[PDB]
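User: Assemble these into one structure.

Assistant: Restating your components, then the assembled model:
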Amino acid sequence: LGNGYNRSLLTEDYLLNPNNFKKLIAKSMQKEMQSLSEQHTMEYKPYKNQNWVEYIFNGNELSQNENAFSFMLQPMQTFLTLQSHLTSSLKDTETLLTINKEPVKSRTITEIFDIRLSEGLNHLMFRCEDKISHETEFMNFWINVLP
Amino acid sequence: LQEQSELMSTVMNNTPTTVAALAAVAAASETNGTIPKPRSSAQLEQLLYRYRAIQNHPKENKLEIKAIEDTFRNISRDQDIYETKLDTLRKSIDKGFQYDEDLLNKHLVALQLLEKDTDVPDYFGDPDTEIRISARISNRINELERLPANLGTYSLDDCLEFITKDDLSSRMDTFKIKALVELKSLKLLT
Amino acid sequence: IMIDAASSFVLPISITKNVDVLQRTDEILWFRGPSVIVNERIINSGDPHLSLPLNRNEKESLPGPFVLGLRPSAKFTAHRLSMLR
Amino acid sequence: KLVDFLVNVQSILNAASVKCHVVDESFPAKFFEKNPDKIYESYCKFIKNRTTINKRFENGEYEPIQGGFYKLYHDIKLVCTILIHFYPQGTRNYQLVDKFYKFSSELLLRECCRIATELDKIISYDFIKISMNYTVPISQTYQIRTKDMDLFSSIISKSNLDKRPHELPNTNFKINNVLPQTDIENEAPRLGFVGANT
Amino acid sequence: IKLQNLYNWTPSNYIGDDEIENFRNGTPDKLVSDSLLKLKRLRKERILNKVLKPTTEERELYFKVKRILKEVILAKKVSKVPINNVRAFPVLQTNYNGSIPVVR
Amino acid sequence: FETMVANPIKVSRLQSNGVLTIHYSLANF
Amino acid sequence: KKEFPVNLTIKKNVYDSAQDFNALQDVKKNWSDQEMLLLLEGIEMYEDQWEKIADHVGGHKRVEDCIEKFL
Amino acid sequence: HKVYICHTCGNESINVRYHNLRARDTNLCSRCFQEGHFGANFQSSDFIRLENNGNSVKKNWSDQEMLLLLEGIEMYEDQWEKIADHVGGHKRVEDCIEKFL
Ligand SMILES: [Zn+2]
């Protein structure tokens, strides 16, 4: 059982879309959807034709043995933005994010990332670790980009 | 110039307030040849309701609002006349006629067949007429080539099968096959 | 775009001791892509929260997905069981 | 109104227990009346400390009220977890109990009601959102990373009320969660493209 | 302009009835039996004209023979009313692309 | 563990479409 | 006598084109698939009573409005 | 009895298959259609659920037997030996022509 092996860091993770995808198209029936594992709600908002989905991962009760996740995206949505809300920036938390092999530093506690995807499957390895306390946590997102 | 379709396109484009078809003396009168009294049930009446509800804010830039209100007065008057005729019809019913079953079976089959434009019997060379046959064949071809591919069925006999959340019952594609046998028999006719 | 790819791989080391819940060959099948989870295969195209009529911010949590699954009543199932024998 | 509602559920529970015989299992009194989220912790306490479902309706143990089907949802969930902890995860009886519970829970949920984001600051400002909320169950899959092949697995048919630790046949195996996609359907092509003239 | 007499609107209530008030005092079947032959004749004239959309003279006529057979069921209480249905109806099902990627 | 590539299972479409399942018909002695 | 079957469930209505099924379209008169299922369910149970069926639909459809779909 | 080897696996169809409408020469399994391992080129609408067991007495011509013959004619347009086995093999070459005419 991993209920005792829960995460101490990584409170909130997001997979929302950047504002350029809305600015280059638009310039809504929102349906929030949740799972029977007490966390990781998933909201989206189509209208009568884009979605602007958002994948919320509240890691306050999620286990650390289950690091990877799998979902599917549309070919119109290729850009992503990650919003990492941690506990506190008391130490230098090493937060590097690679898609497959190329790391992305940042966009500029609250850290904003920029993800540009291609066709096919994706790994999206992200991790958080400290220099003193020696505690690491991993996150993977198996992104299935449709052709 | 498709005045009933321009409002539908402006409603589907979610931009019916920036232009609002630009109803003037040279634009609103050229596409109308007073609105031409559309005959749909609610597909072209709710568009007029939305077209009235949006243009309540400018209140002077559109001059056909009086014609739309006169059309709504005519619709309300026809509704009141239809309700009075429905009351007179329900009060003018005779007590006993004893309507038979065989004539009812004759009327229902004929009225069902005359809905979807097929042949019904009574039971009460020549290249000029071959183009009329080909135009009816191509009509059914173009009708069958507009059906969605994600067509599933649900019969009234599935309750003995106990379909769970993930069951995949074997009576889902009983009409998708018959929607393709006709489409591929109308192509193998030649 | 190729069609005749393999998309099936089996590891040679047989660890088939506690594996009986997965999809066996009759060995374990390992695909190149993951699986997809579909909740209900039928979509109710009515139920006007989805069709969005143009007549009249409101939140409403409906009980269960079975509203969008065309679930029949139990009385017809009991009547069919009475018609069974 | 509720008299036939007591009979139509009984007929389905009698007809849907032929291949597995869930109703004909041995079942004690089991007066818990507790939270169904804690329905197995009290059962484990009953095991540490120390009348079947076909006979409950014959003895008149259920009344036409809300509690008279809350107790039924309690008792079916008691029987299904006993059958899950009795049968192993590979037998066909486990999948039969899982499908019977997924049908019975949906049948007990129906017919009862009838009787921080940069996108949000723009979308809530530009549009009006009507919401609709529901809950779905998820499953787990395996994960193997070989030499540039990225292997995947199938859906595990383990029930949601198993409460067993995640065993691993190999240390190098990884686990992952598959998020189900559900939204409005995409506009599929017509029958002119599906079955075109080749 | 009223409120309750504005939303409920069909293509069947624009003409009203105009003949059934005089026709209900006699037999109910003669006008339907004479109108089905007229609908068949207009259908044959549309087949013999290579036209797709139906005319406005038979769509205005179709809602009267439906209303008469509706009011016979509403009033006369037909003793049998035989059920002849396919016991099925088409719905829209879920579509989803495959999860294995496309190789080139 | 990362040096453990597997064996590909081919489709065999000509063996997938219409393969069946000759001394059983007595015409060859 | 072999005759080609006239599939009325596949063909679209020409005169009205408004009482068709929701998959062939592309109080409240919405007529969703749930109430369309419940209507035929009540007809198959009660055999054309029009009083124990209109409340099995859900009460939102009138007796005349159910016959408007039944025809 | 023909051996219907399913796509993307080495399994055998017991009594049900999923005939494709755009590749037209492959089938799927029941679990493979649930999990969606048919490749991202398709949209899971062009897959007709057909049976694999033996049918009834001859000259009944159900919807599967009527669909597969019209599929095979659009494939080959000749060679009725390759058309009779596309129905399932239980229909004669001399009988499928009499049914198609
Ligand atoms: Zn398979």
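The CA atoms of residues 4 and 44 of chain B lie 7 Å apart.
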